[model samples]
Target: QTDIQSYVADMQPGWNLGNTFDAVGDDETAWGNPRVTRELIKTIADEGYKSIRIPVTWENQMGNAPDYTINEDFFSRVEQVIDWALEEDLYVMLNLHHDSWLWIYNMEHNYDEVMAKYTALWEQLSERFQGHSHKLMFESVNEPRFTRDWGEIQENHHAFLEELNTAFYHIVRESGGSNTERPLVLPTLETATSQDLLNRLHQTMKDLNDPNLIATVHYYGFWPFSVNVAGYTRFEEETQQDIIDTFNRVHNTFTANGIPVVLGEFGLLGFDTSTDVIQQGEKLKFFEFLIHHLNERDVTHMLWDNGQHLNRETYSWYDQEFHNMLKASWEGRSATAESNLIHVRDGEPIRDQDIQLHLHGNELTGLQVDGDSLALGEDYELAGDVLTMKADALTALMTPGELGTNAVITAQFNSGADWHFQLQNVDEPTLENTEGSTSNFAIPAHFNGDSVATMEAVYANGEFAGPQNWTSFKEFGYTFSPVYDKGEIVITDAFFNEVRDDDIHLTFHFWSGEMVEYTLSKNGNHVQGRR
Candidate 1:
């Protein structure tokens, strides 16, 4: 038997086709993405990603109980995508996606029926794709949840995962054709990375005694930082340690023991709304270091792109710089800075901007602005790890007195992706009273050029306000959000759900290090805002 480690290692730096078939609807496009085309699969393969994990929710596409026959048309569409990947010589991972929660979770109470459906579904899948090359892999389920409540472990939950995974393993192995040797990926309870969960999966693999089995888990970073709640505005020590500890556990539990681990999904959870939910620089730092550390531990990571990141319609990255850094991190480390923005107050004399560099063992070799090289002492200076841009050079780069991004300063190093500093011109932002209901409340904002970093809210009594009452700074995108282009800062209905009908103070934290204060009083279903 071929070593699964060598086999799975070749599938590093994978990508996920999320929110497509995995989307719970009558059609794949139900999730807002256009139909998955051969061209899209080709684009993913051409992007140099080694593999693609196609998550499929088969619930709506399958027939009545005892048989659970997959729709022929739906099955063919999935096969077509897989064939395209295999045609492009890319590894393909197929899994039962949202179905895990749709009906599979009922397995706890409806054991016999669940097993019959699960068995029949796998039997059909194995019989169909069994003839494909070993490049195709099967994942038992996507984030399998045995209990209705999440994160709380029970003995039956572990047994349930073991039962489903073991049944899937036997079904595929005995189905004949290439299925006999095809790798099967099984996840821990809820696909969590906790030590107890990782140990459970480790034991399951050992009990199966199949060297071809692969362990899988999904990591969205520490929850507080991942969604930009709990005042984790930066990728600081605590957050960085979270990544290190996770990868180290996965390494020690699986890869270091010769078992391969597929980080089935990894990304900042807030990227769901827009990459802007987490500030640009912080998210970039998170991804760069995350991929680097995963690679260090010989783990394969597949980015969870649910119709974001890479635009299927255009076949181009929505965030090109972020994509570039991700591509670079697959092979090696990259240098990042404390921040990637330099804010110059509008109508004021520019001052030298200092950026503390985190070289990660790389040396700063050169600097450039808009592709034009700059002299060391005249334009900029690097004192150890801190980089300073001369005021004269900054003023020159901010030509024509623009109000927004004037230039992009690129810092080239001897290794990894070049760090970019967006030089922006800014003025203190202002908020105006806007009329709206609790369902769609928003404050008319004039950002001038500055953007939001995070938002803070408190009651007149000094108690924290919004959904997360313990913290004044609410979650980005969830509670308070900034739509800079639209010039509105929306306060979501979720925020209003927990808000008191009293005067509330709001603070808008801007990337320019400026804080603007406003007051909002919630009365019944109506809210009023004042600057």
Candidate 2:
């Protein structure tokens, strides 16, 4: 028999606590108020969620560069909440969260340096929470993002997390803490939106000996409507379906790989009153779908709330009907609720494959496709499988003959299905002359000469070239100028003269399609310019 699993939920308050290095660190007094008291923990416990994640910002709580110690006051307050949650017998995840971004921004440091701080921060945090029961866990960091490319982001963050988690393990084991065997949670890059990163996470998990580390992702698939704080608005059914598909795509991938997953944050914003009921209903439906889906897939998820109303008017439990829906979906299940459904269809397929062609600029210049010539005397109609043209408001429809030459042609169903078309007569050729004078090229003795005047330059071998500047020719009607290093020259106009020693060649193009090439010498000193 499968072990009974309980659904975990988290309420992330103080989400806007200033970053770690902010002038004003997370205000503990304000953040640690009775608002998040034992009563609140009991409230959530009563709601049937087995876990809670308190995302903390501890960067500003640390001292200057040399000493990475967290402020005692700040650390104490965080521990207070953890203790309270544990008292309620709930699994709690405590994280460094916004501190990662805060520290990176303030230090303006390299990735390695930032990671060192990350290591230190986790070491300190894990050491502090060492004696806590397995109910308490650590999330390496939240939503790691400075890198742009997905692969680099995942690789870098995963490496840092693996190192940090290892340190945590050693810290707990040496400290004789129960957490030496505690289950831990780790977040994915950008909360695992990109599939590439998720796959990288699988590879990162391969060598780990701990069966307690759970991979986490945050799901806010319908972000546009769900996060619109200015007001609440209903999303179209089609849009809702797309959101469902996106969630399934991510959740299903991890579930198939035998990884336990947790949704760290997911919710809808309640902003406007008029649409409150509609938004509430949509929220209900969304949770109903999510709960049913997660139950079938065995993925655990947590909802984000600031202990605020689910709607505008009142703070009633009725507003959290979605929570009830989740309970109902999981009723009579084992400790873990896993779905048995297979191959669920989420949305409709997209159609509209044909490209729409448009004619602009010179009307007399007509178009042809597939050897059928089309005359352009007036506007034409082309739709679905038919093409019609008009001249002087009189219409004519012509099909492609065995042999014809036209600029544009619309393919019929039979011919269109077999033929892939290409645009011909669209010339992208380069012009030969009109090189500029910056590089040493043959400039006609004077601008008046029939031959185009161009400039040339020469660089001496073994001489380090200083920053060079150039002025353009005062004369009218110039085209291109080529910059050169030694033997060869490229014709190009309007270019910088202080060419770097590493630059091998330079070229420029003009509206008239003129092409110029500049070549540098092998030794990095001598340059023979041409245009």
Candidate 3:
């Protein structure tokens, strides 16, 4: 049998079949994507991904009491997907996904029953897929967490996961067939990349003494930038540094020691919402840089796609530009910029806009609109890496009546995916005076095609207000947020709970470098806002 490191290395740049069989419901379509098919597996293989992680929820698909036998239909459906993947020459990693939080959480207290169920579940899977190709791997569990409490890291959390991993290793190994030497994947607590967790997992792997084991962890990028909170609206140094630190640690812990590692799932948590939650350019930059470093560390990275990224019906990426950048990054790095937006505010003088370029060893060759190249010296000026588009060119790009995205200017690079610049025409957003209770308060706004980047809340006497009191700027999606489509800035109930019943000064920072000021008074259960 091939070694674990060699086997997993060949599975680089993988994709997850999320929200499919893992959906917690009666049918696979319960979570939205169409039923998994042979065609879907072929599409992924055609897209250049070497492997797929099929996360299955066996909790609801199994019988009760002693046997805990997995339903024949569910097992067959899962096997069908795995078989298709193998047929396409793609590696498959199957695991118990959401069941960790569902019934497996009580493993600490219900040890005997939980272990019995876990053992039986694996026993059947081992026998069913015994003759399958070695390309079909088994992950012990997905983000194995213990107990019901949400963020509570139970004291026995590490130990519990170790037991599960050990049980999985033994059960699969002893079941015979190709599984005797088939590579098995194991996860740290919560599949987190913290040094402590990595160390714990390394020790567990050592104890098992299995040469055919792979370490798995998940990364969602830095939390603030990943979720668009705490004023982290850009892919800045702090966010970039998080990738470096995480990868270095993971590299040191496993890959550096000749133990193969699979980044089972990696994507921004903001993806929980629509991809638009994080700015398109910033999201692309994050993925591009992250994948580059991941490949460097020899960690096989699999994107977490829950039908939000790739469309099942069309077999295409939802964001073509993002997919292009991501695919290109698999081979090498791509050039990006400080921002992909050139905002020209209304009722203000239109001037030249300077955009800073991050070439990453690449050179900017040309700027074009609709396949027509713009004159470098006449229409724009390039000094060093900063490209300045002339005022006259800006005026022409902004259509007379268009409020946003008047035109897109493509910045071509010598050897990477072209960067796109959105020329936007936005006016200063206005908020109207209104009143409501602490629980229900939304400032009616005319966004004027501009989006809020962040908000600052302070008491009349200058003390910061809200959950993040250290800084006047509150969390983007938590304390206060702009609902562009709804034309309102919602002050969340969570924000009101933390603020005092005093005069509060609010500052709304829009993405277009425009700031709007407002005032709020939270007295008792009622709240009032004024411009």
Candidate 4:
């Protein structure tokens, strides 16, 4: 069997034939697409994808009897597709896809009732694919969520999730056969978007103490851009910043710490069947940026291809350029800047120039800038191996200054979260790290080593753990009010806690079951703090 890291590396830039088997319908095509065919699966394998995440729904496909037996009819259909994928040398991942929405997000649902059936379902599937090779991975759930509750109730979600995830691990291992050693995929709560959820999941997975567990989180980083999902439009600068910064956070935090994460899903949302020359170029640019950043961070990403992007019946992508984007980026041939620009825009030449990055001081490929992208002979023709921009384009380069009109201020946090503090006509501010660090990741802040805050809510002239205590009060050491949000208490000036030896006794308060995230400001600008 393959290791988790190797398996994930092989699974990079995967494709999900979504809304087909995963859709809640009577049959595969009930999701309103063509039926699955060996050719479709083969085409995916031929496309250079190393893995396929078949998000399957086992709702009515399984029995509720004592053993929770699965229907052979539906099981055979899934098995047939699995066989095709494996035959094509695909690393296949299957999951108990979206049985019901109620089981996720809301904690008020029957937790034990859900848990009982969930493990039982896995037992049969585990036995069915028992002897499968390591290439087969079983994901517990898709976008599992513990939302619907907020504040303290959020803590319950976190704690209960740990329980469920733990149970998932135990059940899979107990299933015996090849299931015992095959890598298991455990997703965070539904849309595990917030850092708190991830942090909680990390703890649970770590507590499980299994090296083969692959933690998966979905990414649809196009927000604001998320509003419209009908076309390949230009994404906001802030969105790219969000995507890359988060990838860095995960690359450094989770993967670095030994917990491998898969970007279970990611892509631009607004869509339409547009194929003009301009639109085609824009879409390619989008793919370039997406694949570049994802591969740059060396994170595994699976594209969420609804039936629209690639017609299942034809086994061909709607936009060949878009398909090529995935094909190239998956093989690490997309960009030169380590995918730093997210390559969404970097892949396209604005004026039909042979595209490659022109490093700032590189004699070759250097072009007159701030144009972002330039033309071939128009902007500058290649001189030997070096690119020398023409005088006209050189004179038009953007000049660096303190600030510009609506300059983008993207802040990166230790967690895969970026804050785009929108400002109009603002100067580019200098960023700095906080003076001291916490045992866990914390944002630089006005906080000082000398700090103390009696619980305003907990010890409320503070006898209670009221929301007001955290939402509306200052720490004990601050002169003015401290910025207390997400359980972090910032102090203006404060006394350091009692130090024993070289260590100080400090306590971090976290709600039970609620996910905890940390952050602070270094200067007034921002601090690259924790998730």
Q: In order, how many clashes per candidate?
A: 0, 46, 0, 34
Candidate 2 residue 13 Cα shift, in angstroms, is 17
For model 3 the local lDDT of residue 316 reads 82
lDDT of each: 0.89, 0.46, 0.88, 0.56
Q: What is the TM-score of each candidate against the true structure?
A: 0.97, 0.52, 0.93, 0.62
Candidate 4 per-residue lDDT, tens place, 1-531, comes to 336777788787588878777877777777787778899888888877888988887775666646667778778888888888999998889987777363544445676667767778777778888888888898877766554544533567667667767777787898888878889887776645457766777787878888888878777656434322212123446666777777777777578777777888776544422222122333454566667777776678888886777877777788664675567656544322211111111122322222233222223332222234456565566544333334444323322231222222222222221222121222211122344432233333322111122222222122322222223222322211223343234433222221111211122321111112233323322223332
- Once superposed on the true structure, which residue ranges of model 4 sit more than 4 Å away at CA? 65-67, 100-107, 146-153, 191-193, 228-233, 272-282, 333-531
In candidate 2, stretches whose alpha carbon ends up further than 4 angstroms from where it belongs are: 1-24, 29-35, 104-108, 147-176, 227-244, 269-278, 310-531
Q: Write the per-residue lDDT of candidate 1 for residues 1-531, one digit (tens) a residue.
A: 248988788998799999998999997888898888889989998888999999999999989966889999989999999999999999999999998988888887889988888999999999999789999999999998876555556888888989999999999999988998899999988898889999999988999898688999899988888888877889998888998998898899988888999998999888877788888888889999899888888889999999888989999999899998998898689999989898888878778878899999899999987787888898999999999999989877786456788999999999999999988888778889877799989899889889887888899989999887788888888888888779999998998899889988988888888899999989999998998
> Model 3, poorest ten-residue lDDT window?
146-155
Clashes of 1: 0
Off by over 4 Å in 3: 1-3, 148-155, 436-440, 468-471, 497-502, 523-526
1 versus 2: better TM-score goes to: 1
Instruction: Write the residue-wise lDDT of candidate 2 on 206-311 in tens digits.
Output: 6565555667787664644453221223344554575567566656666565566777776553322222322333454455555556656566667665444332
RMSD (CA, angstroms), candidate 3: 2.5
Model 3 C-alpha lDDT per residue in residues 320-396, reported as the tens digit of each score: 89889988898888899988888887667788889999898899899999999998777898888999999998887
- In candidate 1, which residue pairs get closer than 3 Å at backbone N, Cα or C atoms, i.e. clash? none
Candidate RMSDs in Å, in order, are 1.6, 20.3, 2.5, 17.1
